[PDB]
Amino acid sequence: AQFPNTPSFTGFNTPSRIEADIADLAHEGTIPQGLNGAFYRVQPDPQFPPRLDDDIAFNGDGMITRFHIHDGQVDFRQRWAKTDKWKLENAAGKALFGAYRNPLTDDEAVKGEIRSTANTNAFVFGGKLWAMKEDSPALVMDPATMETFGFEKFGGKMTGQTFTAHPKVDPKTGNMVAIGYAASGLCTDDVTYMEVSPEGELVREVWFKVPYYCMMHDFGITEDYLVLHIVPSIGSWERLEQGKPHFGFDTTMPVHLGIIPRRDGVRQEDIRWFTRDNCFASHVLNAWQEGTKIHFVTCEAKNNMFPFFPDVHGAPFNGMEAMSHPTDWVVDMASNGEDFAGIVKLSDTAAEFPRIDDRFTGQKTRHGWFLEMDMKRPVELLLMNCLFHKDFETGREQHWWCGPVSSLQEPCFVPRAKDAPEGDGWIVQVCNRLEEQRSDLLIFDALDIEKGPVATVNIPIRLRFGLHGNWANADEIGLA
Numbered sequence: 480a481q482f483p484n485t486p487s488f489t490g491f492n493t494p495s496r497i498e499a500d501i502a503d504l505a506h507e508g509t510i511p512q513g514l515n516g517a518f519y520r521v522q523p524d525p526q527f528p529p530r531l532d533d534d535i536a537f538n539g540d541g542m543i544t545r546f547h548i549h550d551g552q553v554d555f556r557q558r559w560a561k562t563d564k565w566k567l568e569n570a571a572g573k574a575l576f577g578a579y580r581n582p583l584t585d586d587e588a589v590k591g592e593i594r595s596t597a598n599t600n601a602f603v604f605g606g607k608l609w610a611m612k613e614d615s616p617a618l619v620m621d622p623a624t625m626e627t628f629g630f631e632k633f634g635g636k637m638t639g640q641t642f643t644a645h646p647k648v649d650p651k652t653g654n655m656v657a658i659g660y661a662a663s664g665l666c667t668d669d670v671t672y673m674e675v676s677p678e679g680e681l682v683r684e685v686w687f688k689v690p691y692y693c694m695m696h697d698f699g700i701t702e703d704y705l706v707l708h709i710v711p712s713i714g715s716w717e718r719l720e721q722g723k724p725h726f727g728f729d730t731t732m733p734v735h736l737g738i739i740p741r742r743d744g745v746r747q748e749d750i751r752w753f754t755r756d757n758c759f760a761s762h763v764l765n766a767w768q769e770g771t772k773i774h775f776v777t778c779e780a781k782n783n784m785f786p787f788f789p790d791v792h793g794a795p796f797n798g799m800e801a802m803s804h805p806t807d808w809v810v811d812m813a814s815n816g817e818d819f820a821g822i823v824k825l826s827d828t829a830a831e832f833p834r835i836d837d838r839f840t841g842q843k844t845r846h847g848w849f850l851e852m853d854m855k856r857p858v859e860l861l862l863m864n865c866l867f868h869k870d871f872e873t874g875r876e877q878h879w880w881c882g883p884v885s886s887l888q889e890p891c892f893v894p895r896a897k898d899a900p901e902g903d904g905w906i907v908q909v910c911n912r913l914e915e916q917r918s919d920l921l922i923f924d925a926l927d928i929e930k931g932p933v934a935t936v937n938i939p940i941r942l943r944f945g946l947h948g949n950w951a952n953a954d955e956i957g958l959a
């Protein structure tokens with residue numbers, strides 16, 4: 480097929496569309512024997528040229544990559560997430576769905592069909608692989624064969640239209656905790672709060688409303704709460720009619736933080752809202768309670784981080800104000816009123832794609848890992864050029880730079896053992912070797928990243944820009 484000659488489909492964004500298997504990837508260093516499981520990640524990767532003249536990265540069909548690490552080797556498997564969209568377009572031999580989150584640009588033949596590209600997260604839970612996209616139910620897949628089952632509607636018990644791509648697992652119960660925004664239709668202010676049992680049952684679905692419709696991409700959990708930030712990357716049917724990108728950022732609107740009790744029967748009046756001045760924040764490191772306080776650690780920037788979802792008043796993109804920093808939003812459930820108790824910048828390092836040791840989700844975490852944008856580094860080819868580790872107890876920061884002709888994808892923490900202390904284990908992440916037109920899988924000792932990866936695993940396929948990824952042990956994915 481003939482693709483557009485635009486930035487979104489050329490250079491590093493050239494279509495790939497590869498399904499493949501490789502056993503025992505070539506490598507340098509020592510692949511830890513203690514690793515026995517798989518790292519899953521997803522790349523948007525268009526099956527077909529777009530209906531319109533161009534498209535954005537976030538709109539490519541989900542392609543799932545798995546690195547099966549066992550016995551000191553890494554195996555590679557890559558398969559399409561076969562969404563209803565993928566299936567319909569494959570049968571038709573052409574694109575049928577149009578622009579990002581814009582049904583007004585779809586072929587009439589797919590009116591009412593689920594638009595998901597399943598391209599934002601590759602998550603393992605309850606014996607299934609979840610290929611996730613926040614405008615639709617999640618797509619479920621076999622974690623071992625990587626065949627596709629279909630969309631998870633919980634047998635029809637789910638009443639909302641959508642399911643998050645940023646699920647959290649409650650370590651106390653083992654439940655998956657989820658939201659679904661635009662729950663009653665596009666651009667609506669309805670949201671569902673959901674929990675899924677380890678057995679796969681939808682055990683709670685609570686409807687509530689938020690102050691305004693916006694991209695509710697991420698959220699936090701604590702022991703007793705779901706913590707939902709409301710940030711004004713807004714959308715509307717009018718934007719779609721005016722031919723605009725679905726979302727745009729409004730610098731004039733306030734930011735809110737909603738505290739939802741994680742219990743049956745929660746009502747709107749049970750939800751508490753705090754309010755602060757405008758800023759941008761997308762990803763959540765973690766959240767926790769401490770006394771009467773809630774700590775909500777996010778990567779906060781002064782202004783919009785999505786150039787493709789532009790300022791609603793026409794301002795050009797401000798790269799400097801797009802620099803995000805780990806920041807603790809502190810609210811006090813024992814205060815009166817809506818003010819935050821604190822907004823505390825936690826590092827001067829510019830950072831995004833925050834990760835923790837997920838075994839400690841919703842508890843106070845000593846450690847965090849991030850992708851860092853070090854604008855002081857040489858570049859010989861915004862730029863994510865360092866892995867960054869913060870020890871929040873000691874304050875110590877570690878940085879590893881991938882060099883001047885590379886960039887990095889989201890890290891993932893892998894525990895050494897089920898009983899290991901927080902952070903005792905490894906970091907895995909994809910590295911884009913931009914000049915060599917190829918990719919590496921890097922494995923680090925998670926509490927000593929600054930010495931560099933202990934293994935560099937060569938991938939003889941150029942991987943595309945990725946979103947979120949996750950590790951599962953072999954006995955959780957049918958590979959033991």
Ligand SMILES: COc1cc(C=O)ccc1O
Nearest residue numbers: 536537538598599696946
């Ligand atoms: C890859 O798709 C998306 C990614 C994000 C943020 O990283 C937000 C909405 C999306 O649809």
Ligand SMILES: [Fe+3]
Nearest residue numbers: 645696762947
């Ligand atoms: Fe995300």
